[PDB]
């Protein structure tokens, strides 16, 4: 149908249909008369999967031959989403399969909706891991993603009475056609036990053993015939034992390690099961890495053949684990082992929020990982000796830099451990990386300035443009070709069409079609009722106080009160859409969701408002839902308090898909505004410096309450029970928090936010100019491609050169 | 190579090799340079599996068209063993695949050894279910086997220090290529809750729900293109919730239902988890049966379209469950529902041993299945009213026949429930069925004589002759053709070759080759050391006191003592092989195993004995091991105390494979001797009548101890520590039991057993005559084919006619 989806050859379509029927018959064991859409989805899935295997086997064979430096990306999260369409896109089979399925009397995009999301992540951090695997494969890097195969990913969110309800996400129920179990490569992982010191060295004994079974999933590069591997570990008990029965039933205890993903976004919870997950993935991955290395005995060349990237501190145990293996098993001397470890490891920091920092109680590590605690203490001692030698007499510095935090309960600061054992430490956006050097890690930056770098996040243009917005990818290709898909910088050529009347018409037309399609889905599923002509105001991301969905709520209420104030006055109609999940134990986040639905209950049924304002809460926000709502958005809400959102990635997705952005100078927003020009961005609120000055004199919410009539009115409505008639004090926690314990200064940005919002309503009533500004955003979003991000990691951290060279098909 | 394995067509072998390479590449995602024997086994497995699907789909389609009466075989056990070779045999692909694999440079029988046994059974009862499915498919019956998909079957047995060690049997570890998960047909099963009585009737509410997911495995008939289904249920928790995490982790509680097979052979253990398994399989199976029935509303025709066979009392809850559905859900009146239930259900009894009888505590049923207990009480009342009307004033009869046993703890006698709700009740061998009418169920037989029948057990000649003893199947085919394979009675034609010098030579040659092959395996695996010229004395079956492995032990010790008595005297050399598993909590059974290995420790290292006597304990006895040792046996030990072994099936396997039998007049042994002629059998010991007379005056083991010098000597050696130097009193329990609490009268049969054993040694030293007797056994073993057994069930119980009609390929 459209150019960017490849061609549908006669020979190709015919071969596809043949294999489709083969799988339906032999693989699914079904006939056309009993098959359901699900069966058809699977037949197609296995059909596409077949085209991957040849390339997968050749790619791995290629790496074995050339033996290039290997890149290992360790993460406890890989927010993959659906795999069917992304595979067709990267293999250029989309139109062929679409045709083939058409000829068999089936609607392909109906089948695509049947696929379950691989929701093995919480949000930003996990999606970044997913975009990275895609870019690394597209750039010909010999990379491997290593993680855990959770049988239950992020919970499915349901709203009952306006409240969030969590439901188990049983994504493996009907099977996963993309994975290949590899029981033959099962590895043992040890826990507990004790340490014995002999004349030969230290020995970790009397440990409990848990087996790690790997499952490999193919990661296809963009039309270069490269297929990398994502290896996920699953926990299994040894066959070798209350009673015979109970012993068999207690095997579940060991296998619970890979049972479910901890649903916390940017929040640390020191539970033992979580620590086990962290060590489990690290211990299994390193044995696999060393094994593959020995099949290419001095490890002096180890860092020339291996690079280990730590996605946050979650897999930080890789550092002492690597030392344990090199020292205890291979028997290299400490200093040699340490040198190799630092040259091999790199750490990526994702937030400066204190409650997200991993600090493990020493008594936990002591019981669960005896030898690792000893190694950590040893690392700390040698590290502190260096600090003392560089800053003689600075005793407070020693205490601040220690990997060990003193107090009622001793803890290990995993971030300090990562900095000490890595040759590189990077933030995820320029402003975030600076903040790391100026505040949180100032002492470390002073000792080893060379370790600190910046690597601004990015998103993959394949899934976030071609796959989810074919219409836009097409009209762009028409003007500048398809080369941009693997080189986003080329989108700048679109700057010459900003005054092109035809282009302006097409951009606006694609947006309109996307809105109509989403408006339909919103009514087809969830029986709702939006107006496709209104401005689509959307804020989708995990529910958090620092992300300030509450500030958005205050705007919505302000808009509503102004309409009731002057009903016959004209106002640009809007459809305000807020979506995202709240961690199960985050009370305030759960209240915010209930408040959003409560506002919707009042606003959406007030006859005076009509279809001028609607407040929709998007249920179960996930990768597949993001692919639908983002292309249909007009306005992207990125309003975190300056200094709190390390980078953000959702912001980039919206820029690439034609939405204008209203946000604070935080995270990557700064660089985005910088790339597109501040005039083409809706910036407002305090800058980082303003927040600091305010914390200086002390933030008093009362002040804003007394000086802003409209703000006062909103709080009073909340307190009196205007949005909760049957439970007048339902939102007392929210009001109390905003008035007395607001760590994120919501009130401080209210005035400028409302004014700025008026500025967007004004630009929207002039279609031509709004679209032209949109074109300036899309045209300058090239820098936010994860291909650019990965190319910088490769050259500045891993020491490998990216390659666009097509691999033999 | 051999005729009975089908032909290897040029076109066939070429197509097989092609698909083999296809699966290795696309299915296993491997290349010839990294593939292991396991990968090759799987490529071949998927290749053979492909040939089943076409027939499988057509067979099920055929049944949907003709809509014949359906047969449902409910069993908590299906001891299937390996599936690869059995599938090739029934599809006539053995030689083709053997050739195809040969040309690819692979040894096919090496690959067959890689397949894990599907050990979902304990012994006789479970294997019978397996032989039955095979026969029902071979006879064109629209039959379905229904059970539970245990993820852990019967434990793997290891011997440490002569003691049995149990190890989890993780048979699904590398995957099961034969099964097809059918998540789309998942059904809910209810537990707990309470009963509410409305004006509309009774309602079971506030129950806990557990989902039943089916897995279908194909059951191919013998070269008739019929492929039936065995549907096994797996327990799964509903997605709809201590904490979010704990709720997800507690899903394991519900899924534990199908986690492991209870390892008890002929022994009842009243655990709650077992009751759940029993109801789980019954509740899911009946909804499936009714659903399929409604897709052909009065159930008056239900018994014309459905037959439900209960394999023992394990699935006895099907009776009140069927009533519950018909009365509570469909709303038929009690009397109508009951009529339908009785006409639909049939019960097969497997033992008269009191400790094996299922008697569930009322307090258990009351908590777990509230409504079923009420229905059972109601059934009991109406039943007792009929007893009272037929035997007025016989108050003791009422108490003996009640489904409810009174006492400190009320219990429900499931066998009484089965008899009451079934139109047919059968024993598994003539003598066993008579015993049921004379003793255990005498009262029931008096009330409804028409319900009691006999259906002597049988074994499938496919797996137990063609598959495990190709050499013997071949020399037989040479003389009378291949028709016998699906009509064992034809083996009688072999009676005319009893004097044929050539045949006699071939029979003896096949036996010799089988012994050489087993002798090798015994040394290749387990590093042992037997003499292929000695007589192979074997007793393999579950370890039990009633099976009397102990009597065998006494013979072995007698033989040893006689050799040390007169070292230079000649004696027919023997290799005594005893094998079998003991239930984990059966102390005495564990001691018997230790005693066997202990005797081996003394006998196998006594230089004076030389290679004239060897005592081997066959480790981990299972279906695949039976396929190897049975064809190599010379003497089959079937020495249970008269009246205790309901039938036995191992005895038949040995008859069909060329071994002579030494046994008591018990179970099917009686009919076997009857078929072959008592002169061609080695019968000894007390008859049922003799055991009774002895219980009358009272069994005093002391008497035999005082009158038999050799017996006395053996007990003294045991007591003094002759077979346990480091632990002189190690076997005090055994001696004490034999002397004071022997329920099975071991001593009572010792003298006749030893004498009879001398008779076999005498016949063995005359090769020609021993072989001729062997030919008379093989020639008359036709009656013990499970095809004959199934044909009788079909005509005398289910009301359906068997068919040998080839189904279109
Ligand atoms: O094998 C070499 C080494 O072994 C032995 O030393 C080990 C210790 O026995 C063991 O406890 C561990 O030491 C840890 C210590 O337990 C831990 O608390 C931490 O101590 C740091 C503080 O974290 C740091 O703040 C600073 O403490 C200041 C404190 O802030 C300030 O308020 C005031 O109280 O002064 C304190 C000390 O000046 O420094 C301490 C000390 O570094 O970290 C320690 C090292 O990781 O590990 C040791 C080595 O493995 C033997 O005892 C030793 O002789 C051998 O050299
Ligand atoms: O709805 C119809 C019916 O409902 C109610 O009756 C029900 C009972 O309330 C309920 O308990 C249950 O009755 C069971 C009884 O609980 C159970 O113990 C059993 O009783 C049998 C004995 O098993 C049997 O041995 C025999 O008992 C003898 C005993 O051996 C002897 O030693 C001496 O003690 O005399 C005894 C009685 O003569 O008989 C009893 C009685 O049958 O079985 C009972 C029936 O299953 O279920 C009842 C019906 O569901 C109402 O109370 C009743 O009026 C209604 O007709
Ligand atoms: C990209 C994405 C995120 C991250 O969004 P931010 O606004 O940067 O927090 C979270 N969830 C999903 C499903 C995403 O696609
Ligand atoms: C046939 C068989 C049995 C039953 O043997 P009996 O001697 O009748 O108890 C038990 N186990 C296996 C593995 C069998 O093949």
Stated as kind and residue range, the H or E segment containing B52 is: helix B37-66
CA distances in angstroms from A807 to A140, A145, A221, listed in the order given: 9, 20, 10
Token pair in block for residue B539: 């007793």
Token pair in block for residue B491: 């083996």
CB within 8 Å of B452: residues ≥ 6 apart: B425, B426, B433, B436, B437, B441, B444, B445
Third-level CATH fold of A459-785: Rossmann fold (3.40.50)
Return the closest-CA partner of residue A68 out of A754, A659, A798, A563: A798
CA distances in angstroms from A274 to A151, A331, A343, A360, B83, listed in the order given: 15, 30, 28, 11, 41
Q: Tell me A119's DSSP state.
A: E
Q: Is A74 exposed, middle or buried (0-12, 13-18, 19+ CB in 10 A)?
A: buried
Chain A interface, best mutation among B245, B247, B276, by max A CB count within 10 A: B245
Q: Tell me B769's DSSP state.
A: H
- Residue whose Cα lies nearest atom 12 of ligand 2: it is B377
If you count them, how many residues does chain A have? 809
Token pair in block for residue A412: 């290990």
Return the closest-CA partner of residue A164 out of B248, B210, B241, B242: B241
B5 touches ligand 4 (CB under 6 Å): no
Is A640 one of the annotated binding-site residues? no
Q: Tell me A483's DSSP state.
A: G
CB A567 within 8 A of CB A575: no
CA distances in angstroms from B9 to A176, B139, B175, listed in the order given: 38, 27, 31
State the nearest Cα–Cα gap between A176 and chain B, in angstroms: 12
Report which ligand 1 atom has the smallest distance to the Cα of A399: 25
- Residue whose Cα lies nearest atom 7 of ligand 3: it is A650
CB B269 within 8 A of CB B262: yes
The half-sphere exposure of A729 on its side-chain side, counting CA atoms within 13 A, is 3
Q: What span, in angstroms and rounded, lies between the C-alpha atoms of A2 and A162?
A: 41
Would residue B30 show up in a list of annotated catalytic residues for this protein?
no
Q: What span, in angstroms and rounded, lies between the C-alpha atoms of A150 and A129?
A: 16
Q: What span, in angstroms and rounded, lies between the C-alpha atoms of B320 and B341?
A: 9
Is B371 one of the annotated binding-site residues? no
CB atoms B248 and A259 under 8 Å: yes
Token pair in block for residue A618: 């998007």
Return the closest-CA partner of residue A188 out of A139, A138, A235: A235
Q: What count of other Cβ atoms lies within 10 Å of the Cβ of residue A516?
A: 13
Return the closest-CA partner of residue A616 out of A749, A544, A523, A731: A523
Find the DSSP H helices in A234-271.
Answer: 244-249, 251-255
CB A135 within 8 A of CB A144: no
Q: Tell me A413's DSSP state.
A: E
Q: Where are the domains of chain A?
A: 1-458+786-806, 459-785
Characterise A422 by phi-psi region: left (phi > 0), alpha (psi -120 to 50), beta (else).
beta
Q: Which of B371, B462, B653, B776 is catalytic?
A: B653
CB A617 within 8 A of CB A593: yes
Helix B37-66, helix B10-22: angle, nearest 10 = 110
CB A652 within 8 A of CB A668: yes
Token pair in block for residue B285: 């199976």
Instruction: State whether residue A590 sits within 8 Å of chain B by CB.
Output: no
Instruction: State whether residue B38 sits within 8 Å of chain A by CB.
Output: yes
Do B459-785 and B1-458+786-806 have the same topology in CATH? yes
CA–centroid distance, A43 to ligand 3, in Å, is: 31
Q: Interior CA angle at B317 toward B315 and B323, to 5°?
A: 135
Set of chain A residues whose Cβ sits within 8 Å of the Cβ of B57: 25, 29-31
State the nearest Cα–Cα gap between A174 and chain B, in angstroms: 6
CA distances in angstroms from B739 to B586, B697, B732, listed in the order given: 20, 17, 10
CB atoms A183 and B174 under 8 Å: yes
CB within 8 Å of A295: residues ≥ 6 apart: none
What's this structure's resolution in Å?
2.2
Q: Interior CA angle at B508 toward B506 and B511, to 5°?
A: 110
- List strand residue ranges (DSSP E) for B36-162, in order: 70-74, 78-81, 118-120, 143-148, 156-160
Q: What span, in angstroms and rounded, lies between the C-alpha atoms of B225 and B65?
A: 17
Residues 615-644 in B contacting A (C-alpha not used; CB under 8 Å): none
Q: What span, in angstroms and rounded, lies between the C-alpha atoms of A606 and B190?
A: 45
- List strand residue ranges (DSSP E) for A480-558, in order: 535-540
Instruction: State whether residue B253 sits within 8 Å of chain A by CB.
Output: no
Instruction: State whether residue B167 sits within 8 Å of chain A by CB.
Output: yes
What is the distance, to the nearest Å, from the Cα of residue A117 to the centroid of all Cα atoms in its chain? 14
Phi, psi for A378 (deg, rounded to 5): -65, -40
Q: Which ligand is nearest to the CA of A77?
A: 3
CB within 8 Å of A421: residues ≥ 6 apart: A319, A320, A338, A341, A342, A345, A379
Query: In a mutational test of the pocket of ligand 2, which residue from B380, B388, B410 has the highest number of ligand atoms less than 8 Å from its CB?
Result: B380
CB A465 within 8 A of CB A630: no
CB B786 within 8 A of CB B793: no
Q: Tell me A498's DSSP state.
A: T
Q: What span, in angstroms and rounded, lies between the C-alpha atoms of B108 and A280?
A: 39
Set of chain A residues whose Cβ sits within 8 Å of the Cβ of B247: 168
Report domain B1-458+786-806's class.
Answer: alpha beta
Q: What span, in angstroms and rounded, lies between the C-alpha atoms of A560 and A604?
A: 10
Set of chain A residues whose Cβ sits within 8 Å of the Cβ of B262: 245
Token pair in block for residue B769: 């005559």
Would residue A741 show up in a list of annotated catalytic residues for this protein?
no
Set of chain B residues whose Cβ sits within 8 Å of the Cβ of A166: 241, 244
Quote the radius of gyration of chain B (alpha carbons, Å): 27
SS (H, E, C) B714-760: HHHHHHHCCCCCCCCCCCHHHHHHHHHCCCCCHHHHHHHHHHHHHHH
Would residue B517 show up in a list of annotated catalytic residues for this protein?
no
CB B73 within 8 A of CB B310: no
List residues bridging with B306 in a β-sheet: B70
CB B544 within 8 A of CB B266: yes
Experiment type: X-ray
């Amino acid at each position: 149908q459209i150019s960017v989806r490849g061609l549908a050859g006669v020979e190709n379509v015919t071969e596809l249909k043949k294999n489709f029927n083969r799988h339906l018959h032999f693989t699914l064991v079904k006939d056309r008369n009993v098959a359901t859409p699900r069966d058809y989805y699977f037949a197609l899935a296995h059909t596409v999967r077949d085209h991957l295997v040849g390339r997968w086997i050749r790619t791995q064979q290629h790496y074995y031959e050339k033996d290039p430096k290997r890149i290992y990306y360790l993460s406890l999260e890989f927010y993959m989403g659906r795999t069917l369409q992304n595979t067709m896109v990267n293999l250029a089979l989309e139109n062929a399969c679409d045709e083939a399925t058409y000829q068999l009397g089936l609607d392909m995009e109906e089948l695509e909706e049947i696929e379950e999301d691989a929701g093995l992540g919480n949000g930003g951090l996990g999606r970044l891991a997913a975009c990275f695997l895609d870019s690394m494969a597209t750039l010909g890097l010999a990379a491997y993603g290593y993680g855990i195969r959770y049988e239950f990913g992020i919970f499915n969110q349901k709203i009952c009475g306006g409240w969030q309800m969590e439901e188990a996400d049983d994504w493996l129920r009907y099977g996963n056609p993309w994975e290949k179990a590899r029981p033959e490569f099962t590895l043992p992982v040890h826990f507990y036990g004790r340490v014995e010191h002999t004349s030969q060295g230290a020995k970790w004994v009397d440990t409990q053993v848990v087996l790690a079974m790997p499952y490999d999933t193919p990661v296809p590069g963009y039309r270069n015939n490269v297929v990398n591997t994502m290896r996920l570990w699953s926990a299994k008990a040894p066959n070798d034992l209350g009673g015979y029965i109970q012993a068999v039933l207690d095997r579940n205890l060991a296998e619970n390690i890979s049972r479910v993903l901890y649903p916390n976004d940017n929040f640390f919870e020191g539970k033992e099961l979580r620590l086990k997950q962290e060590y489990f993935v690290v211990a299994a991955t390193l044995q696999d890495i060393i094994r593959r290395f020995k099949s290419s005995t001095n490890f002096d060349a180890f860092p020339d053949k291996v690079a280990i990237q730590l996605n946050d501190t979650h897999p930080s145990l890789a550092i002492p684990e690597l030392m344990r293996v090199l020292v205890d098993l291979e028997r290299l001397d400490w200093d040699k082992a340490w040198e190799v470890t630092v040259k091999t490891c790199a750490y990526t920091n994702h937030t400066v929020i204190p409650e997200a920092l991993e600090r493990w109680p020493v008594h936990l590590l002591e019981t669960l990982l005896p030898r690792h605690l000893q190694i950590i203490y040893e690392i700390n001692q040698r590290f502190l000796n260096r600090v003392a030698a560089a800053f003689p007499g600075d005793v407070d510095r020693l205490r601040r830099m220690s990997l060990v935090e003193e107090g009622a309960v001793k803890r290990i600061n995993m971030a300090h451990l990562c900095i000490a054992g890595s040759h590189a430490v990077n933030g995820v956006a320029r402003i975030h990386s600076e903040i790391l050097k100026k505040t949180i890690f100032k002492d470390f930056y002073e000792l080893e300035p060379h370790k600190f770098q910046n690597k601004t996040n990015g998103i993959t243009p394949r899934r976030w443009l071609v796959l989810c917005n074919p219409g836009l990818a097409e009209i762009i290709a028409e003007r500048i070709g398809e080369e941009y898909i693997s080189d986003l910088d080329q989108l700048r050529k679109l700057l010459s069409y900003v005054d092109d009347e035809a282009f302006i018409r097409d951009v606006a037309k694609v947006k309109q079609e996307n809105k109509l399609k989403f408006a339909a889905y919103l009514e087809r599923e969830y029986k709702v009722h939006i107006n496709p002509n209104s401005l689509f105001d959307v804020q989708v991301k995990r529910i958090h106080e620092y992300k300030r969905q509450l500030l958005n709520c205050l705007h919505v209420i302000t808009l509503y009160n102004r309409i009731k104030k002057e009903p016959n006055k004209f106002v640009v109609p809007r459809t305000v859409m807020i979506g995202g999940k709240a961690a199960p134990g985050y009370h305030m986040a759960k209240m915010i969701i209930k408040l959003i639905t409560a506002i919707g209950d009042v606003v959406n049924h007030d006859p005076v408002v009509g279809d001028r304002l609607r407040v929709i809460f998007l249920e179960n926000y996930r990768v597949s839902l993001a692919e639908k709502v983002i292309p249909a958005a007009d306005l992207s809400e990125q309003i975190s308090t300056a200094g709190t959102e390390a980078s953000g990635t959702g912001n980039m997705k919206f820029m690439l898909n034609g939405a204008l952005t209203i946000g604070t100078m935080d995270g990557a927003n700064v660089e985005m505004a910088e790339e597109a020009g501040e005039e083409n961005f809706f910036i407002f609120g305090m800058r980082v410096e303003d927040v600091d000055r305010l914390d200086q004199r002390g933030y008093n919410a009362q002040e804003y309450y007394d000086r802003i009539p409209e703000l006062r009115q909103i709080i009073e409505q909340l307190s009196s029970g205007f949005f909760s008639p049957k439970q007048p004090d339902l939102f007392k926690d929210i009001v109390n928090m905003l008035m007395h314990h607001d760590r994120f200064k919501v009130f401080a940005d209210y005035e400028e936010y409302v004014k700025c919002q008026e500025r967007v309503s004004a630009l929207y009533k002039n279609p031509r100019e709004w679209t032209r500004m949109v074109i300036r955003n899309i045209a300058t979003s090239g820098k936010f491609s994860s291909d650019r991000t990965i190319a910088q990691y490769a050259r500045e951290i891993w020491g490998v050169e990216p390659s666009r060279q097509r691999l033999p098909a």
